[PDB]
Design a protein around this ligand. Structure first.
Ligand SMILES: NC(=O)c1ccc[n+]([C@@H]2O[C@H](COP(=O)([O-])OP(=O)(O)OC[C@H]3O[C@@H](n4cnc5c(N)ncnc54)[C@H](OP(=O)(O)O)[C@@H]3O)[C@@H](O)[C@H]2O)c1
Ligand SMILES: NC(=O)c1ccc[n+]([C@@H]2O[C@H](COP(=O)([O-])OP(=O)(O)OC[C@H]3O[C@@H](n4cnc5c(N)ncnc54)[C@H](OP(=O)(O)O)[C@@H]3O)[C@@H](O)[C@H]2O)c1
Ligand SMILES: NC(=O)c1ccc[n+]([C@@H]2O[C@H](COP(=O)([O-])OP(=O)(O)OC[C@H]3O[C@@H](n4cnc5c(N)ncnc54)[C@H](OP(=O)(O)O)[C@@H]3O)[C@@H](O)[C@H]2O)c1
Ligand SMILES: NC(=O)c1ccc[n+]([C@@H]2O[C@H](COP(=O)([O-])OP(=O)(O)OC[C@H]3O[C@@H](n4cnc5c(N)ncnc54)[C@H](OP(=O)(O)O)[C@@H]3O)[C@@H](O)[C@H]2O)c1
Ligand SMILES: Nc1nc(N)nc(NC2CC2)n1
Ligand SMILES: Nc1nc(N)nc(NC2CC2)n1
Ligand SMILES: Nc1nc(N)nc(NC2CC2)n1
Ligand SMILES: Nc1nc(N)nc(NC2CC2)n1
Lengths: 252, 253, 251, 251
């Protein structure tokens, strides 16, 4: 039977490109989403029209809280309920906004919980449930960030979250290797910029990229995910592949 | 007059060595602690006997919660209320225990303790530190990281994530606070003082792995690096993390 | 027509797997070799049998010397002479032996072999590659996942491989505006040396988290292939470890 | 008796600050130099005037060649011959100039950039260690905070410095059992010459988060002194950046 993947925040942009390419490759997918219900359900309908009963949606807030463990356990469960298995987990869902150390109107506790939750704690709880329920080509891939060591100004909690994700990637690769589960990452630099991003705001970041002076397409990021879930990456674990067009190599 | 430092989890071991060496260099210290009240107060007594009105304690749980911002603000406030200033912050307090992904604390609690103490508390401490400064000294922060974060212990995933996060704060905060004159750096031990309840056989197993001396670092050795980072000899150093590991991270499996 | 690749030290083991997998995907290959002439020609014969006029050999010492630039120029030239083009360069050739700091080769020779093959040849090859330029041009450098946790007494090897990391980054940066991508593949324990004891091979194997076994040469070639493919067209400056978790294990 | 250090390229700028600062802490210094004879001798004079018989000069080209091993052995010998001991070695001498991949020859570009930044440091380390085979022995290597985000067209330089990182780790590992520590100090922008363009110097200074300015040579030397000091007795294989946050700034 066909394998199954969970992709978090999979309704739009890069998560969608991931889920669609996995689907194109023959996976059944669970499309996790948070606020993007229309796009999530429109996407699962598109994929089910191509192959009946191959896409399902699952809503969940991945903000850290007393209930996050249960939410993540449920996301994994949806995959098993629908498809009877879970072969792959893509941690793509991520909050990203500035959190100045020195003075949007959220509280710091809410900043902490949204940035560290989505980027690190949820990934960890998802990995925990993924692993527990494995009772093959099993693997996890985490959406990281090529610029963690040269981070954006005032994005300390985001950056802290992505660095945590790299440590989860290494820690989880180490511990789950004996269960046959590989754990790896893909680290974009500038990929899709918000549709909002005034077309010349984009170019300020686009002009910085040595390979092409353009952002990555979502499909280019997904290509790396697909490679890491594939049988061509069977020996690869604990690895994080940057797909940044050289941007992290560019000095100030 | 004399500058002041906040040292978290300062009641024993490495934190204590840091607070003692900073005191010996002329700092007034706030000795934060969580459960170690008798050691915290015994230490402040010793330092105030050496120089009156130079050491104060501050109890606070740094587990993550909706009140942790408030606790961290208070820690900083206790330094200003005692000493009228806060010149350095050492983020040393840290929970450390295994959190297996698979095969009595709840995971919510495992998360809140390991991520709180190792990362979120340091972030919040740093925010309160920075907000309380003026907008005229050698202001800096030092974070106690971990040399082994890229080759971590088996089943310590939450701890490791906390330390990696600390690394990212170090960088992020160095970048953001450099314009305020506030340097931010790290010291990354390997094996320093060891558990109370591990056998000499297991302590010897870790010791044998250290290329420089086949021995763990003394707490004073770690403190030496902190002192360097706070000193005027490191005034251009920010965003840097100094490993003090006797080569242990260079040893392959 | 078909693209062409240069693969250094391609006569056996990992370089052979790279050149065969490249050939299997439709590339014409230059099989560079140094001492392994019988295996080089035997491989080019096997590939030309499968597809006539698709494999050629090229002998060259990649020890550092004042003629090394010329050797590396010739390697690239062989590719253009045979196939009219050069689309891919795989820097696989490498010397590897201990060079203790507290000690039959002289140190001048240890330096020239370990630094030349693992770093300066690669640099010179990439220069020649670049100067000689629809397409998907890229370079893949064979690095080593253990550079930060190196073997005892292999300082010149390790320096070579760390230098290869730097070329990777520096070349990626500089050649990106010419459309040329530059990336690496960093094995841990892959094929073991035939002169190793089976007992000492097993000791390294038992260290690998993922399978307690060394990588096959094919498994390394897979990652090279990915990097040269159209699926990696935004990837440059990147080095992919293929080590089964070996570098994440503490002492 | 006072300890002795060798500092390479010590006639001017950062090497000079290192030597001066070591001298100020009670070391006898061997001031190595290449072309800067008048500054080397003028410095040794100043230091000897302060404390008689505590500074000596030693000329050597550190470009890679057949004779580099010998030259590096002599540099170490000059310290033993003058002072009867050698306790620290600072590898500061370095060539730095562009080497585009697309008036010197490439063979000479290779020998100067890789020799000064890497191979000489290795050979010095080898001689240092062999001559040893209370006491605080260490080596400190001048690295470069920007090796992972290198300057455009400085391939060979960057390869050199990455190599130096590798030697640092490899030597730390191998020499730790002899009690010899090996560490590095990684500047970002420190002294920029007043001959370099005010616009281009301003671009660089404006990029530094901490102060919008270059490090003084003395600030770099401070980090060297820390690492040689008894306050760094457990530190080995570590490289300390002294870059004012410059390497944390994205493009
Ligand atoms: N685009 C880039 O240049 C770039 C660069 C570096 C790294 N990355 C990484 O690549 C990934 C994908 O990037 P993207 O730009 O496609 O991401 P994005 O659009 O900003 O976010 C992806 C998804 O995250 C979900 N999300 C946000 N908050 C959530 C919450 N509290 N709970 C559950 N889900 C939540 C959203 O779901 P809903 O809309 O359904 O609410 C969203 O569709 C992320 O991991 C990101 O950090 C991207
Ligand atoms: N020892 C080592 O080999 C080693 C190795 C690598 C890195 N490090 C790093 O070096 C630092 C110091 O190490 P160490 O061994 O001295 O540390 P430790 O003894 O394990 O912990 C130091 C203190 O942290 C405080 N702490 C724990 N949980 C807390 C909480 N929830 N709220 C507030 N405080 C809490 C405790 O204070 P109370 O006792 O008062 O409760 C404890 O005494 C740590 O940052 C560590 O991660 C140490
Ligand atoms: N095998 C591993 O576990 C492993 C681990 C980490 C990294 N790697 C890296 O992966 C790549 C291939 O590894 P491998 O194990 O296949 O390597 P290998 O067999 O040791 O080397 C491949 C070829 O290197 C060539 N070579 C050696 N000295 C040369 C010289 N002076 N001039 C020109 N060519 C020379 C040889 O060519 P000839 O026989 O024709 O003379 C040899 O067949 C290398 O870059 C290696 O450093 C391998
Ligand atoms: N200044 C900076 O912003 C900066 C930034 C990053 C890293 N660094 C690193 O820090 C160190 C000191 O830098 P700096 O700028 O003071 O250095 P520098 O002026 O460029 O060079 C230092 C000395 O190296 C010696 N040297 C050059 N070529 C040589 C050769 N072929 N043989 C022997 N010696 C040779 C020269 O000595 P003679 O004058 O006697 O010929 C020179 O005075 C270097 O390791 C450097 O790469 C500096
Ligand atoms: N790094 C990152 N992380 C998230 N979650 N979202 C985004 N969106 C980018 C601004 C387009 N980027
Ligand atoms: N917080 C922390 N971090 C590490 N690595 N080790 C320790 N060890 C102490 C015995 C508890 N504590
Ligand atoms: N060139 C190279 N590099 C490594 N790491 N390993 C090997 N193994 C070959 C059998 C010696 N070769
Ligand atoms: N990185 C480096 N290395 C050397 N030797 N010299 C320099 N000089 C810079 C122009 C001040 N930079």
């Amino acid at each position: 039977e066909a394998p199954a993947a969970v992709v978090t925040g999979a309704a739009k942009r890069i998560g969608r490109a991931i889920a669609v390419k996995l689907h194109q490759t023959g996976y059944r997918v669970v499309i996790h989403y948070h606020n993007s219900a229309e796009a999530a359900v429109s996407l699962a309908d598109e994929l089910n029209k191509e192959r009946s009963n191959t896409a399902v949606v699952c809503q969940a807030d991945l903000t850290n809280s007393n209930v996050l463990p249960a939410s993540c356990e449920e996301i994994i469960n949806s995959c098993f309920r629908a498809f009877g298995r879970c072969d792959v987990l893509v941690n793509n869902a991520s909050a990203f906004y500035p959190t100045p150390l020195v003075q949007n109107g959220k509280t710091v506790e809410t900043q902490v919980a949204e940035l560290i939750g989505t980027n690190a704690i949820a990934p960890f709880l998802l990995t925990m449930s993924f692993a527990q329920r494995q009772k093959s080509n099993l693997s996890i891939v985490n959406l990281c960030d090529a610029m963690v060591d040269q981070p954006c100004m005032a994005f300390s909690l985001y950056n802290m979250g992505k660095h945590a994700l790299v440590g989860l990637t290494q820690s989880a690769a180490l511990e789950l290797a004996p269960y046959g589960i590989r754990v790896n990452g893909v680290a974009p630099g500038v990929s899709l910029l918000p549709v909002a991003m005034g077309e010349e705001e984009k170019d300020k970041w686009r002009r910085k990229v040595p390979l092409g002076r353009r952002e990555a397409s979502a499909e280019q990021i997904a290509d790396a995910v697909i490679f890491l879930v594939s049988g061509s990456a069977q020996y690869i674990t604990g690895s994080i592949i940057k797909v940044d067009g050289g941007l992290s190599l560019v000095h100030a």
